[PDB]
Each structure stands twice: as C-alpha cells, then as structure tokens.
Amino acid sequence: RAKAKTRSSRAGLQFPVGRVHRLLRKGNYSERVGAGAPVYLAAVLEYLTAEILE
Amino acid sequence: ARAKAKTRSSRAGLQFPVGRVHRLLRKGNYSERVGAGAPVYLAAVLEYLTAEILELAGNAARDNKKTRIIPRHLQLAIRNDEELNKLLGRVTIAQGGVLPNIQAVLLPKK
Amino acid sequence: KKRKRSRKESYSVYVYKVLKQVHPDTGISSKAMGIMNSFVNDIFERIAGEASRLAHYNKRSTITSREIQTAVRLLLPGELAKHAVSEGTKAVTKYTSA
Amino acid sequence: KKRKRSRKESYSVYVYKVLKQVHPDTGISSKAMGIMNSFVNDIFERIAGEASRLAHYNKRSTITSREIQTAVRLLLPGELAKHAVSEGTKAVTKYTSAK
Amino acid sequence: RKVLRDNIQGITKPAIRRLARRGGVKRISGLIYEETRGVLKVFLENVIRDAVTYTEHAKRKTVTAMDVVYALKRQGRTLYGFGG
Amino acid sequence: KRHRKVLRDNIQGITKPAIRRLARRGGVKRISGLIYEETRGVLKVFLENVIRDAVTYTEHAKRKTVTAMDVVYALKRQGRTLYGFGG
Amino acid sequence: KRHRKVLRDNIQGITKPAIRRLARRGGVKRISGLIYEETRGVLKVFLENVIRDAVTYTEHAKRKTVTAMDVVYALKRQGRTLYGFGG
Amino acid sequence: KKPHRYRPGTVALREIRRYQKSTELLIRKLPFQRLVREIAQDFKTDLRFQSSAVMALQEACEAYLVGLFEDTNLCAIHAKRVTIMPKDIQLARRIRGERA
Amino acid sequence: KKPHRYRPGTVALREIRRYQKSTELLIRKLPFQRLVREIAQDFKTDLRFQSSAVMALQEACEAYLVGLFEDTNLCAIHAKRVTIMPKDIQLARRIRGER
Amino acid sequence: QRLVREIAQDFKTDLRFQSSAVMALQEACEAYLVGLFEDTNLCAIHAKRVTIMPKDIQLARRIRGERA
DNA sequence: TAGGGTTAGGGTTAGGGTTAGGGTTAGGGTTAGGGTTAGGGTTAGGGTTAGGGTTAGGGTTAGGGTTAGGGTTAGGGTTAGGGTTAGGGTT
DNA sequence: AACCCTAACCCTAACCCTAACCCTAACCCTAACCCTAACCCTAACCCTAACCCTAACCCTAACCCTAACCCTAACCCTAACCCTAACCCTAA
C-alpha cells in the first residue's frame, strides 16, 4: 500500500490485466491460475480489438 | 466401528456405478460443490441410453445369425432408429460401413 | 513386473452386466467394447457439461439434481427424453428412502 | 431506496481507448459498443476453454503461459495467430525483465 | 395471445419476397411462398422451446433476451448484440 | 544414406481403382474422367488440417511421437468424433 | 553415412549481415528492420526462374548435369546477359 | 400511352440493389409478435415475453431465411434455370444437414 | 466364342451392392503410410508415428471421402445427369460450408 | 550452394551441379539485388525520408514492370 | 531381405448419354385502383421482481477399515477358409 | 438359353474366454462444521391492455412476354476383357 501502480501499466497493455485474473479464477476454469497467464491473455484480446476497430 | 457397509449403487438398484461418477464430477472442475443426489440421477440416465443401444444392436445380429455383437451391427442399429440418429449424427463408428441405399434413377428401371 | 504400472479405469465390467439383463445369451467382442466404452464416456461430458454453465448463469454454486434434469431435457432428442427423465427420478426416489 | 444499486461490469472503457491510438478522430455509437463488448467476451471463452482441456489431458493442474499460448496457435487462423503469439511474448518479457 | 391461422399468414407474400431479394433471387415460383412458411415455423419451434427450458430453471415467468441469446448459441448460430 | 526418391509419396496411392472403389460405396454409377485429380486435391486439404492440430498437441507435451489419442483429440475439434480407434 | 537431405532452412541462410553488405554497396544508409524478410522473397522468386529454364535446357540434351553454358543460355532470355563465366 | 413500361427483368435488378444496401428488418413487427406467442402457448401457458426478446427472435429468423435463399440460388443456377422452385429449397437442407 | 459382355453400366450395379455390404478399407496401407509422412515433414522433422495414428487417419479420411460422394451424387441426379463430374464437387463444398 | 540445391529438387531429382553453375548464379543474383537497392534508395529520398523500408521495394518493382 | 501372388496398368470398342437446337404454352412480371391494419401515441393498474436478514440441513473433510475392480491365463466355442454342392438368370 | 452366376455346408482351429487368484487400490462409515437455499415484506417498474387514427401497405385483377419443357438427332467419351509383372504384403 506504499504507492499504487496498475498491473496493466507495468506490462504496458491497455486492456485490463487485473480483471482477467479474477474472471479466469472465479469461472472454475482451473485450480491455480498462474501469473504469466493473465498478462499473455490481456494481449491476445487487445491485438484483436485493434484489428476490427481499425 | 461401522456395521453393514452396503454400497451406493446397491441401495439405488442401478447397475452402473454411483461411486466413480461422483469422483469424476468433483475433479473435472465442472463446479465447486456436487450435491449427493446428483451423481445418482446421472448413473440412471446413462444406463437407459446403453440399454437402448445394446438391445437394438442384438436384434440386428440375430438376423445375420452370428451370436456376437460386432462394430457393423452397432452402425446398423444407431443409424436406423430416428432419435439415436439425431444424438449420434456426427460420430463415425470405426469399421462400420454404410446402410444399403441405391437411388431409383441410377437403378435400371426397364 | 517391477514397473508398478499406474493402470487405467474402464466402464467395461458394467456394460457386460447390462448386456446380460436385456438379452441373456449373446456376447460382445473386444472391438465392440471399445465403441461402447467411448459412448458411456462421451454422454458424460455433454450431460455434465451443460450443467456447469446452467449453474453459472443462475449464480448458484452447486450442480444438484434439478441441474441434471434441465440438461437431459435439452441435450437428448424427443421420446428418448421423456423415457429417461422419468427413469432417473425413480432411482433418486429409492435412494432417498434407503 | 438508498444505494441498493448493482454494478454491471463491462469492458467498454478499454475499447474507447484502443479507438484513441489506432484512429484518433472517430467515435463509436452505442450499438457498436454492444457488438464489441460481446466480441471480447467470446474470444476469452474460447481461449480459457482450450486451455482447461489441455491442462487436464496432460494431467497437470495450472494454466501457465505455454497453455494460453497453445490455444492461440490452434483456435485463431493463419496471419492472426502469427501476429499474436509474438505480441504476447514481447508483453510478458517486459513484465519479468522490467520491474 | 391468439390460436388462429394469422400467425403463419402474418409472414405475407410481399415480405416473403423482399427477404428473398436481399439474397439475389430474380424470379420466384408460386409454390415457394407456401414451403417458406413451413421452414420458419420449424425454426421458431426449436429456438422457443429451449428458451422456455432455461426460463423454468430460475422459476421466472418472463422469457428475457439473454435466454434467447443462450438458446441460439447452443444450436450453432451465435448472435452478438441483442444481449451480452 | 538416402532413399533416392524424396517424393514422400506425392498424393500417390490414390490410384484410379481406389477412387473407383470409394465412390462405388457412395452410390456413384458413371464416374467422369476429371474427378481423379480433384479428389486428390480434397483429400490433401484434409490430411494436412488433422495433422497441423495433431503435431500442435505433441509439441505441447515435448514428446517426439504422435500417439493416436492425439489424432482422436484433434478430430473432435474440427467436428467428427472417431469412436474407439484410439479411445 | 550421410543419412540426411537438404531441408528448407536454406532461404534463411542468407544472414542478416549479408543483406546489410549488399545494400551498403547500393548507397543505402539506414536499413529498416522489416526489409530482411522481403529481400528473402525477391531473391527466392528469382533463383527459381533462372533455374526452371536451366533444367529445361538440360533435359533437352538428356543429360543429368546442369553445366554453366546452360545458366548463361537461360539468363540471356529472361533479360540480363552475364559475360564471362561462360563462353 | 407511350410510357416507360419496364420489360420483365429491369424492376427486379434495381430491387436486389436497393435491398442489399440497407440494414432495416423486412417482416412487420405486429404480425411477428403473434407467431412467437402462438408457438409458446403449447409449451407453457401464461408465458410473458420481454420487449427485447421478441426482437432477438425476429433478427435470427430473418437472418436464417436470407441464408437458405442464397443456397437455393446457387442450386437453381446448376440446372440452368433462373427461377427458384420448391425442389431446390429441399435439396439445400439435405446437403447442409438440417431435415435429413 | 462367348464374349458375354454385359451392357455398359450393369457390372457396376453388382459392384455397388457387394461393396456397400463389407467394412474393409479401400486405400492400401503402405502408400497411405507415406502420404501422412510427407505432410508431417513441414510441421516438424524427427516426428515418429505410432502404428495406431496412421490407422485412425485412414478411417477418418475414408469417411470424409465416402460422404462427399453421396452428396455429389445427390447434386448430379438434380440436373437430370446420372454421372458425377468435376463441377458437381464444388457445389457440395460451398453448401456444406467448408469453402 | 544449398539454396540452389533445395530449389532444384522440385524441378527434377538427381541433378548434379558443376562448380561453375553455382558460381554464375552467385554473380547474377548478387547483381539483381545490388540494383533493386539503388532504385529503392532513389524512391526513399523522394518522400523526404533517408531510410529504405518495406513499402519502397514494391514501388520499384511495379514501375520497372516485373510484378505486373 | 526374399518372394510371390495379385493389384494396378496398359491397350480396344461400342453403346448411350450429354448436348445442342428448335418449337409451344402456361407462368411470372408489370402497372393500376380499392380497402384497410399496422404502426405510432397516451393512461393505468396489475404482474412480476430485488434485496435482505435468518435458520437448519446439506454439503465437506479428515480419520479409520475393507471391498471391489484391475491385471494375467489354459482350452473350448465360435468362426471363418475351403472346397464341393447348391442357387439366382443375363449377357 | 448364348451359357453366365448364387447358396447349402464343415471342417477348422484362434480369441473370447470363466474362473481364479491374488492384491492393490479406492470407497465407505464415523466423527467433525458452516453456510446457504430456503425465508419474507416491499416498493418499484415494466408488461399488458385499452383506445384512436390514418396513410403507407397489402389485395385483387388484366395483359403479354419469356423461360421451362419436350422432343429431335448425334457423336464424343466412358464403359467392359486381357496379358502382364510390379509392388505390396507376409513373415522373420
């Protein structure tokens, strides 16, 4: 709680990297999410939303 | 201490297991809590479907007169009944041939 | 041998008992066991599978008996549904008594 | 009366910030936010559904990056999975290398 | 509300041609109009029956839009838009 | 050191008799001449697609052998469930 | 023995420095990053086109060896005219 | 009267163009709020439809019919005809995997 | 001299009836073993195929092909023709949706 | 030596390349490539840029007439 | 790596099935006037919900025993080869 | 009716076998809890129904021009024997 830096900003991705972790965990997809997976899956959604929106 | 130690499949009178089916629902990650009543409904619903395929399969083998069910009989039973041809309509049974049908125009009329 | 093989599980013993009840004098070849054992393991992923989603939409967190009766009225056809929703409740009724 | 207000959650702020990098000057009408917020929720239920089957077939219990990457190689087609496996690899490399 | 024949006669002959002209057809035979009232009645029976089964699970007596977006998704024709 | 031929079977073995045996099971009565080159073009875009997904699963386990459970797992995704060849 | 044959890694055999030494003779000062894949596309079409005409002359003479007076007789038709490495 | 009586085939190639460049819905709303409610009375009595689920059934039963019609047209141009006929709609469904 | 030449197209009706009543595979195993080996080289080299993997691929591939030819036939009988042709195969693939 | 050998497999197999044939192919292929770069450079200096890029190579090939 | 038997691979030939052309007639197309119904509004009242504390029974869960299911194995019961006889017509 | 194919066996002889037999491993009874699907006013909104209108849209004739169909030949091309003898099986 010393200072607040968004987990999206540290990896420089616009799409949320905190919300995708809760939705992967609370949908019962698997027992232990891991921490290299929320960040990879918030970048394969952002590239696709930047192909249809351009 | 314990006493009778009677089995769950025996209590409900269903041949298919009601012990293995509960473990698989719990560790497949379908949902966090599985109610005890639910495995018993699944074992019964699966049993009726196996009895329909095996009973219909046997009749077709009797007509061929061989005394063992084999893959070709199962295709002929599954692909004839209307309801079982709309659940298993995409599945391809291995070593199963095709049902015999020839269109009239190809067939020499005269 | 000294391998200590993990081994596998099969619903093959159970299928043989059912074959005996419906017809008491026929038998099944091993290739036929393979097609049948797969079906019992493919109608356990469609029927259980629709139950998982039906729990989340509602917000409820358990897969109880009603949720496996709204997944047999949707993933099974027409008259193999009325004769299977009815067959299942009878076994649940007996279990509750004993 | 007071409060008693549920909070609907939608990815709509984040689709009005990728329209402000690719094309400054244009704006999205309300229906297009609909037909977009229902796209992000459809390619997140096809990459968390081929990564919860790959974990179980191989008898393992965690979805690490390799698993969320096997799905992109299978579900997305050509000239779309190629321009996506790389985009993720640069984005995770920054997370570990730079703190 | 009703139980008459105006249900399938509501898809009138002009609007069973304009739907077609959005597809490319240039001449339409007389009996297409009867067969294409039959095919729409079967599709609606299958989409409506599955919406009712989900509605009963929650005990509600109103068939909301999300239930139709979940009936169509199962049969292979996803809809995007009129729902979430 | 090397089989002199490196053709890896160029869509071969589907000889006129094999395509005139599969078609006859189908119901075809008078197969036309040009079909043989085309039916060696449709088999080709299918054997590749089951294969690309099949290798993709094996590289995930890091093993170097394509076992039949990998082909049954790939065939389910495209749409046809083979029952029992692998189980 | 030599139990291996030439795979298709060759097209990436041209290295990243070699395309930066055939472009510094050309006057280029700040080569951009994406050029390296494109320059392996322009060379790839050219090497096939001199080659197909080269094999077509050799098969006319029913030999099995592509000698340089065949490359020089193919390169004249396409457009260039190498003078020197040939007669 | 020397007018502009258009010859058969020039008021149908101007119609295909106007209707293929629009986004509106062809079926009238009130007659499709009664087909939906006479196919529901049989399944359960007293079901009250919402006002956005009688427009998500219109936009999925007017985008499957404009789907059969393109497949009927490819079939009726394979027998050298330009007029869709009722023996074409039946072929399209069989191959697609719908009624058989 | 007995030519006994059955008129054109009557040997084949006997062929159709006998072929539809048996399940043996109709493409030879040794040639097919190689077509898969060639189409696997591009995806990776050093891939070793177990015996069952070639067998499954033969049962699926025969089954897709047997089907395309029952739908091509249905299209041919529509135009009043009685023989399959190259053009008919392409209407079946556009309608089925494979494209 | 290898790129030429791989490209030759498709046209025929059992083709044996004399030493001079792979030398000539090196002194023609370098010359086509050295040239495209001088024309790509002329195009780049036109737009006010000082660096070659992927788009510039395509204008040089359409104008020279090779791609069609 | 033998080796051996049969499957594919070449020829001819005659029939039959596309295919192009040439008439014939109902059937969609194209305008033109009558007779609405399907859209909009406004009220209003009932008909179904959205939270919110509150039990109590149904789960989970972590200990024991112990039962039931999963591998291995001779010898018999089909079950196909394997030849005759049958039997269908079939050019 | 040229003279071609269809239908009894019957020896033949490996793979489904019942045990049968351990025995390994997974269920079950027996004790703990917690937590949630039941419960309830309410107050809120939104679906249903009713009323009015009116003007674009359907409906029902007439007239006549194409396009679907049925012949007509005919002529190319796909069918059905026949020596191979090459290659795929079959062990091993």
Curated annotation (Swiss-Prot), chain B:
The modification N6-glutaryllysine is found at residues 86, 109-110. The modification N6-crotonyllysine is found at residues 27, 109-110. Keywords: Acetylation, Chromosome, Citrullination, DNA-binding, Hydroxylation, Isopeptide bond, Methylation, Nucleosome core, Nucleus, Phosphoprotein, Ubl conjugation. The modification N5-methylglutamine is found at residue 95. Residues 1-9 have a biased composition (Basic residues). One of its GO terms (biological process) is negative regulation of cell population proliferation. The modification N6-(beta-hydroxybutyryl)lysine is found at residues 4, 27, 86, 109. Belongs to the histone H2A family. The modification N6-(2-hydroxyisobutyryl)lysine is found at residues 27, 65-66, 86, 109. It is found in: Nucleus; Chromosome. GO terms for cellular component: CENP-A containing nucleosome; extracellular exosome; nucleosome; nucleus. There is a cross-link at residues 4, 6, 110 (Glycyl lysine isopeptide (Lys-Gly) (interchain with G-Cter in ubiquitin)). The modification N6-succinyllysine is found at residue 86. The chain holds residues 11 to 120 of 130 of the full protein. Core component of nucleosome. Nucleosomes wrap and compact DNA into chromatin, limiting DNA accessibility to the cellular machineries which require DNA as a template. Histones thereby play a central role in transcription regulation, DNA repair, DNA replication and chromosomal stability. DNA accessibility is regulated via a complex set of post-translational modifications of histones, also called histone code, and nucleosome remodeling. It comes from the Eukaryota. This is Histone H2A type 1-B/E. The gene is H2AC4. The nucleosome is a histone octamer containing two molecules each of H2A, H2B, H3 and H4 assembled in one H3-H4 heterotetramer and two H2A-H2B heterodimers. The octamer wraps approximately 147 bp of DNA. GO terms for molecular function: DNA binding; protein heterodimerization activity; structural constituent of chromatin.
From Swiss-Prot, chain C:
The modification N6,N6-dimethyllysine is found at residue 31. The modification N6-glutaryllysine is found at residues 8, 17, 20, 82, 90, 94. One of its GO terms (molecular function) is protein heterodimerization activity. The lineage of its organism: Eukaryota, Metazoa, Chordata, Craniata, Vertebrata. The modification N6-crotonyllysine is found at residue 8. The chain holds residues 28 to 125 of 126 of the full protein. The keyword Membrane does not apply. This is Histone H2B type 1-K. The keyword Ion transport does not apply. It comes from Homo sapiens (Human). It is found in: Nucleus; Chromosome. Monoubiquitination at Lys-8 (H2BK34Ub) by the MSL1/MSL2 dimer is required for histone H3 'Lys-4' (H3K4me) and 'Lys-79' (H3K79me) methylation and transcription activation at specific gene loci, such as HOXA9 and MEIS1 loci. Similarly, monoubiquitination at Lys-94 (H2BK120Ub) by the RNF20/40 complex gives a specific tag for epigenetic transcriptional activation and is also prerequisite for histone H3 'Lys-4' and 'Lys-79' methylation. It also functions cooperatively with the FACT dimer to stimulate elongation by RNA polymerase II. Phosphorylation at Ser-10 (H2BS36ph) by AMPK in response to stress promotes transcription. The modification N6-(2-hydroxyisobutyryl)lysine is found at residues 8, 17, 20, 31, 59, 82, 90, 94. The modification N6-acetyllysine is found at residue 59. The modification N6-malonyllysine is found at residue 90. Belongs to the histone H2B family. The modification N6-methylated lysine is found at residue 90. The modification PolyADP-ribosyl glutamic acid is found at residue 9. The modification N6-methyllysine is found at residues 20, 82. Keywords: Acetylation, ADP-ribosylation, Antibiotic, Antimicrobial, Chromosome, DNA-binding, Glycoprotein, Hydroxylation, Isopeptide bond, Methylation, Nucleosome core, Nucleus, Phosphoprotein, Ubl conjugation. It comes from the Eukaryota.
UniProtKB/Swiss-Prot annotation, chain D:
The modification N6-lactoyllysine is found at residues 17, 59, 82, 90, 94. The modification N6-malonyllysine is found at residue 90. The modification N6-(beta-hydroxybutyryl)lysine is found at residues 8, 59, 90, 94. There is a cross-link at residues 8, 94 (Glycyl lysine isopeptide (Lys-Gly) (interchain with G-Cter in ubiquitin)). One of its GO terms (biological process) is killing of cells of another organism. The modification N6-acetyllysine is found at residue 59. The modification N6,N6,N6-trimethyllysine is found at residue 59. The modification N6-methylated lysine is found at residue 90. One of its GO terms (molecular function) is structural constituent of chromatin. The modification Phosphoserine is found at residue 10. Monoubiquitination at Lys-8 (H2BK34Ub) by the MSL1/MSL2 dimer is required for histone H3 'Lys-4' (H3K4me) and 'Lys-79' (H3K79me) methylation and transcription activation at specific gene loci, such as HOXA9 and MEIS1 loci. Similarly, monoubiquitination at Lys-94 (H2BK120Ub) by the RNF20/40 complex gives a specific tag for epigenetic transcriptional activation and is also prerequisite for histone H3 'Lys-4' and 'Lys-79' methylation. It also functions cooperatively with the FACT dimer to stimulate elongation by RNA polymerase II. The keyword DNA-binding applies. Belongs to the histone H2B family. The nucleosome is a histone octamer containing two molecules each of H2A, H2B, H3 and H4 assembled in one H3-H4 heterotetramer and two H2A-H2B heterodimers. The octamer wraps approximately 147 bp of DNA. This is Histone H2B type 1-K. The lineage of its organism: Eukaryota, Metazoa, Chordata, Craniata, Vertebrata. The chain holds residues 28 to 126 of 126 of the full protein.
UniProtKB/Swiss-Prot annotation, chain E:
The modification Phosphothreonine is found at residue 62. It is found in: Nucleus; Chromosome. Changing residue 45 to Q: In a breast cancer sample; somatic mutation. One of its GO terms (biological process) is chromatin organization. The modification N6-methyllysine is found at residue 2. Changing residue 22 to C: In TEBIVANED2 and TEBIVANED3; uncertain significance; does not affect early development when expressed in zebrafish embryos. The modification N6,N6,N6-trimethyllysine is found at residue 2. There is a cross-link at residues 2, 13, 41, 61, 73 (Glycyl lysine isopeptide (Lys-Gly) (interchain with G-Cter in SUMO2)). The modification N6,N6-dimethyllysine is found at residue 2. Changing residue 19 to P: In TEBIVANED3; results in early developmental defects when expressed in zebrafish embryos. Changing residue 80 to H: In TEBIVANED3; results in early developmental defects when expressed in zebrafish embryos. The modification N6-lactoyllysine is found at residues 13, 59, 73. The nucleosome is a histone octamer containing two molecules each of H2A, H2B, H3 and H4 assembled in one H3-H4 heterotetramer and two H2A-H2B heterodimers. The octamer wraps approximately 147 bp of DNA. Found in a co-chaperone complex with DNJC9, MCM2 and histone H3.3-H4 dimers. Within the complex, interacts with DNJC9 (via C-terminus); the interaction is direct. Interacts with NASP; NASP is a histone chaperone that stabilizes and maintains a soluble pool of Histone H3-H4 dimers. This is Histone H4. The lineage of its organism: Eukaryota, Metazoa, Chordata, Craniata, Vertebrata. The chain holds residues 20 to 103 of 103 of the full protein.
